[PDB]
């Protein structure tokens, strides 16, 4: 609705930074509303949905198994690894690592799964093959969060991420059991409370994944809708602000409040 665009512009003003926004109808792929749809933004942890989508396509193809246990050691642990640090002794299965990477944004789990897949170049090859010629992963955790101005490495565009998310979630690329497993991990997100979830009405569905990075970068990709079903994809990215984490969260939650008021 154009009143949400008023709130996105107001957020650009309050944060003193670019905000990219898109609202996409999940059924038809129709772009309902957009602001900077084709400017690049750092993906940060929102790439971990894409990563487990690549993992699940290998599971579907018989090239990977969800129950396979990955062992790793203290040498692999990078900053913000709340779940992998606690499982050094016995390792974790592919399924556990995707739950940790999505639900808890665990950085080591993402690196371990990127190794399983053949690294950033293979996730980017996977994206290219499903028609996304924009999103690219170039580095590993934690480097990919750097968000240096004008750098195309590890970026997407709001319109590209929304279209890719839609394909992953409703297209024939993944088996329905796999699409459902990706949706379940996103629904179980534990780390995005102050963002769209704080504006979500009772009874609504949300599956999402947040990200934060350097230079004020913050973002969220989400599939949400009334009556327990997703019917729209919302993607929101910001970078460049010098505002605190709480101010960045606050403005994204106010963009959410506007889009839900005007649904």
Curated annotation (Swiss-Prot):
Keyword Hydrolase annotated: yes
An individual GO BP term: beta-lactam antibiotic catabolic process
Keywords: Antibiotic resistance, Disulfide bond, Hydrolase, Plasmid, Signal, Transposable element
E.C. numbers: 3.5.2.6
Residues annotated as binding substrate: 209-211
Cystine crosslinks: 52-98
Superkingdom of the source species: Bacteria
Industrial and biotechnological uses noted in the record: This protein is used as a marker in many commonly used cloning vectors, such as pBR322 and the pUC series.
Catalytic activity: a beta-lactam + H2O = a substituted beta-amino acid
Entry keyword annotation includes Phosphoprotein: no
Active site (UniProt): 45 (acyl-ester intermediate), 143 (proton acceptor)
PROSITE patterns: BETA_LACTAMASE_A
InterPro entries: Beta-lactam/transpept-like, Beta-lactam_cat, Beta-lactam_class-A, Beta-lactam_class-A_AS
Effect of residue 139 to S: In TEM-5, TEM-8 and TEM-24
Effect of residue 214 to K: In TEM-5 and TEM-24
NCBIfam families: bla_class_A, blaTEM
Family to which the UniProt record says this protein belongs: Belongs to the class-A beta-lactamase family.
Miscellaneous notes: The beta-lactamase present on pBR322 was cloned from plasmid R1 (R7268). The class A beta-lactamase family has a specific amino-acid numbering system, sometimes called Ambler or ABL numbering and often misspelt as Amber. A multiple sequence alignment was used to derive a consensus sequence and then the consensus was numbered taking into account insertions and deletions. This allows use of identical numbers, e.g. for active site residues, despite differences in protein length. UniProt always uses natural numbering of residues, hence there appear to be differences in numbering between this entry and some papers.
Identification of the protein by name: Beta-lactamase TEM
Organism encoding this protein: Escherichia coli
Taxonomic placement: Bacteria, Pseudomonadati, Pseudomonadota, Gammaproteobacteria, Enterobacterales
Gene from which the chain derives: bla
């Amino acid at each position: 609705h154009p009143e949400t665009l008023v709130k996105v512009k107001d957020a650009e003003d309050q944060l003193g930074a670019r905000v990219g926004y898109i609202e996409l109808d999940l059924n038809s792929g129709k772009i309902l509303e957009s602001f900077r749809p084709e400017e690049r933004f750092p993906m940060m942890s929102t790439f971990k949905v894409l990563l487990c989508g690549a993992v699940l396509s290998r599971v579907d193809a018989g090239q990977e198994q969800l129950g396979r246990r990955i062992h790793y050691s203290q040498n692999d642990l990078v900053e913000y690894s709340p779940v992998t640090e606690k499982h050094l002794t016995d390792g974790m299965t592919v399924r556990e690592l995707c739950s940790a990477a999505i639900t808890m944004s665990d950085n080591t789990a993402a690196n371990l799964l990127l190794t399983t897949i053949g690294g950033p170049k293979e996730l980017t090859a996977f994206l290219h093959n499903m028609g996304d010629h924009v999103t690219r992963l170039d580095r590993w955790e934690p480097e990919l969060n750097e968000a240096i101005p004008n750098d195309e490495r590890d970026t997407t565009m709001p319109a590209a991420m929304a279209t890719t998310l839609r394909k992953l979630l409703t297209g024939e690329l993944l088996t329905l059991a796999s699409r459902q497993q990706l949706i379940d991990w996103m629904e179980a997100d534990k780390v995005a409370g102050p963002l769209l979830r704080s504006a979500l009405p009772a009874g609504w569905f949300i599956a999402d994944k947040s990200g934060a990075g350097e230079r004020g970068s913050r973002g969220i990709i989400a599939a949400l809708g009334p009556d327990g079903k997703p019917s729209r994809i919302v993607v929101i990215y910001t970078t460049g602000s010098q505002a605190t984490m709480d101010e960045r969260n606050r403005q994204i939650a106010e963009i959410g409040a506007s889009l839900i008021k005007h649904w």
